[PDB]
Structure formats: C-alpha cells, structure tokens
Design a protein around this ligand. Structure first.
Ligand code: CUA
Length: 119
C-alpha cells in the first residue's frame, strides 16, 4: 500500500507541480501523476502517446474520488493519503473522458477530465 501525506501533496512530491505530471520512464513507458480535487482533475488534459504503456499514479488532496476512463477497464477509487496505480495502453488516438465514479459533493456530476492520446 503506497501512502502519501494528503495535506502536503500540492507542496512537495510528484503531484506538486502540475506541469510535471507526465514523466517518461521507458522508451514507450510513461507515468502520469493525477491529483483529484473537489471538483477537478490535475492535470487536464492528460496527454500521452498511442501504444505506450501508461502508469497512472492517482491520489486525492481532499476527499474520496473516482477515476474511470470511459471505453477502458480503468475504474479505481481515489483515497486521500493513498496512491492508486492503474496500468493501461491506449490502442486508439483521440480523446477519452475521465469521470468521477465516487460521489464527492456538490460538483460531482460535472467532475470530468480529458485524456488526449496522440498518434
Ligand atoms: Cu470526485 Cu465525485
């Protein structure tokens, strides 16, 4: 179980700088640091190449959220203080919508993100 301090995730660690969310870890491997907030996803959009192995590292800076990418088998809870790891390879270029699968307050029904998969 990979744990982090939710009260400092925006000040230190790999979720602190949104511009550095996508890190290449291999020739066709990328780690993506996703930080869920009430009520939006950091970063937005997530930009990754087609056919690359993506390792999502997702955590929350406040409450329980969800991270479900439509058209995929990605569907995980996002707990404050814990890192959810999801591995996925996007076969087709285009845009994939992230939806929050866990009720998280007022703007839950509009908490959407975007993943743009480049050819
Ligand atoms: Cu985040 Cu519902």
């Amino acid at each position: 179980l990979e744990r982090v301090d939710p009260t400092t995730v925006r000040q230190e660690g790999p979720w602190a700088d949104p511009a550095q969310a996508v890190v290449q870890t291999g020739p066709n491997q990328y780690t993506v640091y996703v930080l869920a907030h009430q009520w939006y996803y950091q970063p937005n959009p997530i930009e990754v190449p087609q056919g690359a192995e993506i390792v999502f590292k997702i955590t929350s800076q406040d409450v329980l959220h969800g991270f479900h990418v439509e058209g995929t088998n990605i569907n995980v809870e996002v707990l404050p203080g814990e890192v959810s790891t999801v591995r996925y390879t996007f076969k087709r270029p285009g845009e994939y919508r992230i939806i929050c699968s866990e009720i998280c307050g007022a703007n839950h029904s509009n908490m959407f993100g975007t993943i743009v998969v480049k050819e």
